[PDB]
């Protein structure tokens, strides 16, 4: 497992960089246990049950839908994602994308003027990139 790049550098240079003129609102790399590996300045503080609900939907897709994607006390409505890989949520003009790696979770929160496809693109790429090292 490569230890040469800091998780702070990953979120700063691959999650919060400019894409199509816009920026993510907040981003974080978090373990499946709930330990945040790195997070931007304005990323919310999770609650333990919120992460467990996220993880239960990854284990059985469609189980978080009645409850909603709860991140930092904020309720997002779950929308379509990839089973066992990506969980997405919408809160009006904003939203969030949670991408699953082998050991961690990549999370990006956007608000207008950012499209959901751009938040999807950046977050999921770093997800796939780290899955391909075993991370």
């Amino acid at each position, epitope marked *: 497992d490569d230890d040469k790049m800091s998780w702070q550098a990953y979120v700063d240079d691959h999650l919060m960089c400019e894409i199509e003129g816009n920026h993510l609102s907040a981003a974080a790399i978090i373990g499946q246990d709930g330990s945040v590996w790195a997070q931007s300045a304005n990323f919310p503080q999770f609650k333990s049950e919120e992460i467990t609900g996220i993880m239960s939907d990854f284990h059985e897709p469609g189980t978080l839908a009645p409850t909603g994607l709860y991140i930092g006390g904020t309720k997002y409505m779950v929308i379509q994602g990839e089973p066992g890989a990506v969980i997405r949520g919408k809160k009006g003009p904003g939203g969030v994308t949670v991408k699953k790696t082998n050991q961690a979770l990549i999370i990006g929160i956007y608000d207008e003027p950012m499209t959901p496809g751009q938040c999807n693109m950046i977050v999921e*790429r770093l997800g796939d990139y780290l*899955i391909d090292q*075993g991370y």
Partner: antibody
Amino acid sequence: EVQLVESGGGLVQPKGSLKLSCAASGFTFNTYAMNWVRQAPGKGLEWVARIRTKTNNYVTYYADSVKDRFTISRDDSQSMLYLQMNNLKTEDTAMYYCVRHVGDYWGQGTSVTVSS
Amino acid sequence: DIQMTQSPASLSASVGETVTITCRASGNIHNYLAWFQQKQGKSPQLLVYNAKTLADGVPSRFSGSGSGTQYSLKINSLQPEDFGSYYCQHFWSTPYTFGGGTKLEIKR
């Protein structure tokens, strides 16, 4: 510790087929995505294929140059990578390396000449 | 597809001098760029992975720089073992295209 050893290269007449192999040792092969990269005799490098881990259903991505002719596969039970080549053209004559993820470790290379 | 254009093609410098090889993408690769050095008769070797992260066993005279569509590799205090060619490769989206290469001769 990490060592990639290619094999299978050789001389093949045009429109032929050939199956290169790559043996990986020194790391958990199942947790990494693998590449095939080739270099023409005097020219530069060109990326031709990539395969993913079991987590993403062993997805495969090819270059348009070799899009409908080449096939990349892997046997994680034996820590082996394969490149299947069909309808070999003159433009395929090159040296072929297996590459791990973004290029941390390359292989010795196996040479392939397509000529009459 | 994101094609990449490297420059210059050839560079010659006496030992002790400093050179930079610039590499440009047709779109934002969002700092998913790696640098490889290759010598005649041998396989390439990774110098800088991602925009600025040096790989294991690489001298610190290699500074990886860049952002957006333009990146560069700086070699300060050039040493005689730095001859060869240098290729840049992006990993944003498939195809993971290589570059044209920059052959470095050592003025002597």
